[PDB]
Amino acid sequence: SDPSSINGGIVVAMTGKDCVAIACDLRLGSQSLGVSNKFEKIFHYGHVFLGITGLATDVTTLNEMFRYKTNLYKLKEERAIEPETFTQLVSSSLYERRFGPYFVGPVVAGINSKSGKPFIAGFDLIGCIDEAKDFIVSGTASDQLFGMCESLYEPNLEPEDLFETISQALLNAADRDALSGWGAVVYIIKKDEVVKRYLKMRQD
Amino acid sequence: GYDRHITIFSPEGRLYQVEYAFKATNQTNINSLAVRGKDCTVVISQKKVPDKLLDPTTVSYIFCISRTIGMVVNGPIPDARNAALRAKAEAAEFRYKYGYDMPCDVLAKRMANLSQIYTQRAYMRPLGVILTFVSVDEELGPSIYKTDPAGYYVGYKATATGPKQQEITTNLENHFKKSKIDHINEESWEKVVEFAITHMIDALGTEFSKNDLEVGVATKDKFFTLSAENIEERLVAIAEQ
Amino acid sequence: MTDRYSFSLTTFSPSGKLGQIDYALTAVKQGVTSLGIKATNGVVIATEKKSSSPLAMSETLSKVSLLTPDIGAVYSGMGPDYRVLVDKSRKVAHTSYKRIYGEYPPTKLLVSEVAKIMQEATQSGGVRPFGVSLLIAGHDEFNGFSLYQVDPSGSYFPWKATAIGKGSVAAKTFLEKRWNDELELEDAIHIALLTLKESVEGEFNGDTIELAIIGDENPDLLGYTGIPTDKGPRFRKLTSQEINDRLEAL
Amino acid sequence: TGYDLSNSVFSPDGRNFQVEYAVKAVENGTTSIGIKCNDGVVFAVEKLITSKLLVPQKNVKIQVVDRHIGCVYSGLIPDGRHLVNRGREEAASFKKLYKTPIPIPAFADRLGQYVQAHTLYNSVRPFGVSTIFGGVDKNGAHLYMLEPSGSYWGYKGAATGKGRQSAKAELEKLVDHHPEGLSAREAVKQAAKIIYLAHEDNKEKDFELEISWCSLSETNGLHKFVKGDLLQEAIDFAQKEIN
Amino acid sequence: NNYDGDTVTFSPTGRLFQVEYALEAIKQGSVTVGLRSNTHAVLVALKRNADELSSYQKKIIKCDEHMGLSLAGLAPDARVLSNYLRQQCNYSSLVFNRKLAVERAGHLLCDKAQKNTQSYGGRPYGVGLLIIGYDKSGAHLLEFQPSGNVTELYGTAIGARSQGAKTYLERTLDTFIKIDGNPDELIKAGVEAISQSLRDESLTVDNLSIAIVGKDTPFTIYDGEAVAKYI
Amino acid sequence: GSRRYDSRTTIFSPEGRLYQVEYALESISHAGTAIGIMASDGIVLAAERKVTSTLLEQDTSTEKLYKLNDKIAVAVAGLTADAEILINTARIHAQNYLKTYNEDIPVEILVRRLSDIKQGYTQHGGLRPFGVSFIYAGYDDRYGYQLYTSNPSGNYTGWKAISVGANTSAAQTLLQMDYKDDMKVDDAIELALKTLSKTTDSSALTYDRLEFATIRKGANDGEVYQKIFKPQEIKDILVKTGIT
Amino acid sequence: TIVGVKFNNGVVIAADTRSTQGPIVADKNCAKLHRISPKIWCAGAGTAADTEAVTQLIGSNIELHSLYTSREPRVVSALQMLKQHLFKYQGHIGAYLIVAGVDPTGSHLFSIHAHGSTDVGYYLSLGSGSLAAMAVLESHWKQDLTKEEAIKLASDAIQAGIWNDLGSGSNVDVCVMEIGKDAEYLRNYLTPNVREEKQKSYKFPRGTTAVLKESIVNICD
Amino acid sequence: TSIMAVTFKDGVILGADSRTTTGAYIANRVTDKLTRVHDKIWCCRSGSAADTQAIADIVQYHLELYTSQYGTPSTETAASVFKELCYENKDNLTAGIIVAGYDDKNKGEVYTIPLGGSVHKLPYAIAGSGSTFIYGYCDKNFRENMSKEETVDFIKHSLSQAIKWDGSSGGVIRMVVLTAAGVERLIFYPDEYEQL
């Protein structure tokens, strides 16, 4: 009866030098019962990346809804939505359901294709925007992730260094949470190539 | 031609029902005139009580819209009163929603936008009235804004409306070519009222008794209409001149 | 009581004309001349303030309206119709864009919404078409400078330069002579003033000409400092003084 | 042309022919008058006795609004009743919110704005009555006359229907030769006379006289009908003055 | 002529033709008489058959224990108006424990008919009604007409050749007005009245409809064998 | 009342024709010609602009050719503003389908819904019909490459080659003459231009009066690419097919 | 912690830069100072999304109002629109706002509560840190503050909140609205909570993390 | 809160304290609880600050529109508009309002509207949490037709006691004098009224 912790799962995003990283675990459960080992929580619309933790039905629904809105955007604007603009679209859409919210912790990551600037943001379930230069965390092990990120993180990491940091931050936070883990995915995002790595992690 | 019956375009791009509404403007056979002082705005309209059975006190075409805004109508009284009640409602709603007194030019714009909707939607006829709004606005100072059945409106240094309007207009344009300024350079509203009546007399070639006029005055933080006595005082001042 | 006109007042005639759109365009033809020119580094829109009475104060009548900090509009045709379109245009920029994306719409998409409103008055029950053509000048980061014409039908087209109303036929010929793709904004203002001199009968000065530009950002017009990435409106109305400076060098 | 087939259409004159046609149905009606007095108003009406079968005294046409307002009308009688029903809702609504009974000028504009509304659309017909109404409020006595256009003014005396010009002639005479005022009891007699006089313009059928009054001294500012001794007294007064 | 296309259009002389055409449907309707004393009120109606093989149209409808009416014109319009009056009589009872005054019934019918004469797309009622009742102020007869004009009378008649009975009642006035505490005598004076509106036919046993209401008499309808007494 | 001013936009003539549909088609017959040609390896859409002025912005304009989704495009003949209302509806309808089924909308389903909307305006509501005819070019994994047209009547049909707007009688004769089934996209391009070249009411066909689009498999293995040609790309194709 | 202080020729509002989710700091440098219009600024405490959303809605409607009337927006309009909106929603929109600005009418300072009650004052504080801040305001405030005195008092009042309230921390943001001039927004006016340099670099040797699979993602068409 | 309205020879005087509390915390110590709904019709507010402000704003709106159409409304008319809002919405409102006004015909009038939305015309009225403590005092010391100075003293002494005993009341004593001579605002500071 706490929607945000029925299914479990975590998302973390970090900025580095001319790059961003966004990572998620693969667990979907029904309380104690692990159900699926392949439930990915990171989606993308063009070059803008969205991670969603929380109630899994709302994760799936919001992804389907933002794919819908960014498709119409692209047809009318004749260009892909940028991360700053998408962040505002997510915020508007969550606050529209103010008195019947989606039970989710969305995380935006991407590089502004014009300025070249790396961008991350996070939100509460009703739409409030937390924009941080350093890192954003979300999900059942957000306390653990805040702890790991705040120690491990330093500014201006090269993509291959940033990979080690975000990975270690997620891996060690998931291992201290019952409802998170069961496999992880890490997206390393540079100006014009995106590398996606599945991490080997303990399966308990 | 049913293009002459509702507010749709004629072949030559015209709205006859708007044009015919302008003609209803002059049915009352009353001329109105507004001028700005330094500190005040004065609006005078001819008062004509033909029937002896009428209560002359109830015969008016000047309306108190808000504390600060006055309105003179050139047109039939039913449409005049429709416009009055609506402006009162709008000026009160504005004050409740936005926490300040509706400005003269904003009420004018709002009544003009309403008028425009009648020129575009078929089921509403235009009102056969021209509305002259006057106040001393807290931002813009002495103000005259006029609205017609086309939904047109603009601000005026001074203005006249009615059948003999063109004579009053040129009379005022002549004064302002000479005077070289935007307004009546006068301290007291009493002497601006005297100017307004004097220049109406010159332009119409007729004299007035106290019962032949009706006068509205806007000062900072109130608009009020003069009694028969207030005007008699004003007419006597003009006599000894 | 209430609207019983739920049927269209604009219908196809046997020739396939839409009578009421044709007649709206005739109303626009009668309207006072307005024009727009697109330079490399900005856009100018200009029109005559043909005053009704000389007792009128024609500065209280704005024919050139800001729609967003970076978009301006001018018209030829029925003034009241323009005024309520400006009101609806400003509002739709907020309700259908800014309240969603937290930024002002790009020029073509605000135009697209204005066009939509005007199309509806062409087909909805119990209304006549709008009796105006609009020229909308605007800037946006990804499209740069643009100029659009919108007609009573709801049709819009982008222009390097054009004119609408009274003397539009002559004005367009004059603009064709003078327009090149290397015009600086000051060059376009100069041409706009020459073109508008053709179709102006009486007085030609800063008090009878209304002229606005979509140009450089004006931090001095923003109203606040301290946010470096907010640099202020690109829409600027030229003052009576500023117009008269360029008439001495005309 | 054809500008007169649809209510709310302006003619090239700037006229609404359907309202002007409504007036003809009013001009066609029985005569009715109102007389403003010192501290009140008097209403009277001519009722054509169609047939001997009409029960005398029992087809009342003067209608009360609230407790303090009398309404009488010439023209289409059902249109009159419809306008009074609306007036009664307006006075109820006003009293409900503001506690005080509706002042007469306030009440006048409520009827005015409603009647005027029936000249704004082609889906309604204008009212086929001129309405004479008024009474006593906190500011004193008020008589009004309201026309199918929605036009109304305050009146010293008023008349409408077939005998309006005969009635108006006799009213102008009262106004001229009583400039300091007329008493409420006097106005009842004068009313009787003017109805008997104005009946000459309508005299195939013989008629029934009906009077009402609001007087701050005589009825305590309430609307009552004139009956019994006072009615017969005014009937006798009028019978003298025709010979 | 040009001004008769709808109820919302005045003629240049200030007439409503759709209302006048409505009034015409009554004129074409079969005759019905109403008349009253101080104690009783009687309705007599001539019922019209389609041919020799048909029933005779019901003209009289009961509205409450103390009120009823007779119709001439469109029968369905009478059904709507009588149904509306039944509801107003009901409402008066359930809410105020009060039998509806015949005068108030009159006013309510007038205002209901009026709405249809001022609004677009509607049509005037195509029926005339005579309403009898015995309320707290004695016996009453009303004449309703679809213009909205309701009239209180000692007696009247409406429909085809009604003028005959209407003149006779005007002559008889002083006789019948005082048939107090005699049911049979008021009915026979009603039967005599309707007989002035007959041509090439007289009152038969399934032709004639009589209704009475009075001091100690519920509104009740006499038809068939129970009117043989009165021919 | 208001009946007097009602045109009755949704009634039958004595011959059982819809007046307003007939008059809308008459309106469309004066619009710039649009051609669709379907090859075995893609579809061509070519449309002629309503006579351009030398001062119209050529590249940033889209009068005729619109994107519905990544797999479907339309060519428009008629009132542009009417077309834009229907296009935004079609774009939403395609996105509703993707949201519901997690599959791109089949071309016919989209076409049928737009045609059903047009039909409605001819049967109820007493409004004027849409003064628009569409050529739909699209691809789905069921029927592959497809051309359809719809018109104000709400009727729709499938085509190998079709034209709408002005001089369709002339254009359908020339297409019927030179179209073959085996035809590749590059030949279909040449046919489209040669056909407009001959039916045009202009003296000569130039780059600045043309909107041109292809839907090929001409990217990376069994995935579909939409190409809306820039001014320069049309100007080049106009020289390579030898019309300039 | 949010404060407003009136002075001779204007009004100043200040705020801390801490955002919290339960006992966790979500954002160490969020901006709680919001622009309703160029010369009307808002400080927000309560439900974070509610104060941002209500500030933007009224800010949008105020911009349209300004364009419709051809007038500078007034603080009393922002006040009336906010209070009527918050009232309609009977406190379910958890917005607590200090609304300050300059307009043609002069300089104004107001507080709005979630239920739609408003207060006038020369100095105000709101939020968890309001008592710490009000202690400083009640100790130092005098009639006829200069600009520099009002800024110092406002930042002193926020510092009380940063130090003594667990709900407040990090930096001090100021907005100065002076009659006649442009509002100046001093982002991170004071930064007295800089993180000390860490003892160690946790930068990992490359290839520390164990990987199952790689792939290039396609963001192109 | 401690609020009262007292009728006297020349008109009516409204009195209130200036303290607003959230629990034991004084949210505002210089509150104005004397609020104008018309030139010479004022009210004293007690209850939810949101509810009484929203009501007072709506009444000011109704009376400004009343004035436009029918001229100056009576004190009774103003009280009737407050009652209408308070009674019809009794389930969603916590509002105790005293309405005080000056007509030139009717002189000074006081109407109290307690939580139910009932209306009571009184020679004087007291309300707010602090009123409980001065019922005894006010009943003993009030006389009809007092002078301006006597009525100012009666209110000052009365609210002085209410403030002394009620923790919810305090700050300055604000008063508003309503007579033919116009409208007068009075303020009395702690250092004065405390040691009465």
Ligand SMILES: *C(=O)[C@H]1NC[C@@](C)(O)[C@](O)([C@H](CC2CCCCC2)NC(=O)[C@H](Cc2ccc(OC)cc2)NC(=O)[C@H](COCc2ccccc2)NC(=O)CN2CCN(C(=O)OC(C)(C)C)CC2)O[C@@H]1C
């Ligand atoms: C000074 O006094 C200072 N005190 C600090 C503080 C924290 O009290 C605050 O009021 C801030 C101010 C805001 C800072 C951000 C800019 C806007 C103003 N308020 C918060 O930080 C609030 C605290 C708060 C208040 C009231 C609450 O009632 C439920 C809860 C929490 N923070 C939030 O609301 C918080 C914001 O999350 C930021 C964030 C960003 C990115 C990722 C994650 C988080 N979010 C929540 O509290 C979420 N909460 C979930 C449930 N909810 C809810 O309503 O549930 C439903 C089902 C009913 C919808 C409410 C929101 O500053 C003052 C000045």
Ligand SMILES: [Mg+2]
């Ligand atoms: Mg685990």
Ligand SMILES: [Mg+2]
């Ligand atoms: Mg386990």
Ligand SMILES: [Mg+2]
């Ligand atoms: Mg119209």
Ligand SMILES: [Mg+2]
């Ligand atoms: Mg409440």
Ligand SMILES: [Mg+2]
């Ligand atoms: Mg105390």
